[PDB]
């Protein structure tokens, strides 16, 4: 369905061949393409946002509609900030792919599933370590 992250690029889910080794040239190229498309899309969305923000902004004479026009901007900027935070993660993942050290958990040497990487291409840890770390985080935070 044209709404996921494989949709952004014109790629369809990969399919590891019977005797296919784990990290080959083709998979790494695939993931690089995916990340590059995702990024370029996000940045073009930022450009849209900025053009909108630059066109709309005006001085309203009523205080109960200046708030109206500055309560949608807060949400918009929130989404843009979040995606900007994800642009650094994508950049780092692009650095691991270029360095040919992509696809393995940082805590334990186990390799992360291919299907999980096609799910969330920025994955840094395996599902088990991810869950444990998320629990430890949420517990140390609250």
């Amino acid at each position: 369905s044209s709404l996921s992250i494989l949709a952004i690029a014109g790629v369809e889910p990969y399919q590891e061949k019977p005797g296919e080794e784990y990290m080959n040239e083709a998979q790494l190229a695939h993931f690089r393409r995916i990340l590059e498309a995702w990024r370029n899309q996000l940045r073009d969305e930022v450009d849209r946002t900025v053009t909108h923000m630059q066109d709309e902004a005006a001085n309203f004479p009523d205080p109960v509609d200046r708030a109206a026009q500055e309560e949608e901007f807060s949400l918009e900027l929130r989404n843009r900030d979040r995606e900007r935070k994800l642009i650094k993660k994508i950049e780092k993942t692009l650095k691991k792919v270029e360095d040919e050290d992509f696809g393995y958990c940082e805590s334990c040497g186990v390799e992360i599933g291919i299907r999980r990487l096609e799910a969330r291409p920025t994955a840094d840890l395996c599902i088990d370590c991810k869950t444990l770390a998320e629990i430890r985080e949420k517990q140390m935070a609250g």
């Binding site: 109960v64 509609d65 708030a67 109206a68």
Partner: protein
């Protein structure tokens, strides 16, 4: 088979002042706010209708 309770009626969310405005469901929250605030300031006319 999981719902323990249910709202008594739709109006229970809002006060009387806001409850008097018709078609709140189609009004932005800010303008409902200002509407209620001024509506409570109305002066009685000569002949109520």
């Amino acid at each position: 088979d999981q719902v323990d309770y249910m709202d008594v009626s739709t109006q229970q969310v809002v006060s009387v002042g806001a409850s008097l405005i018709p078609f709140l469901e189609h009004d932005d929250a800010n303008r409902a706010l200002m509407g209620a605030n001024m509506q409570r300031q109305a002066v009685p006319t000569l002949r109520a209708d």
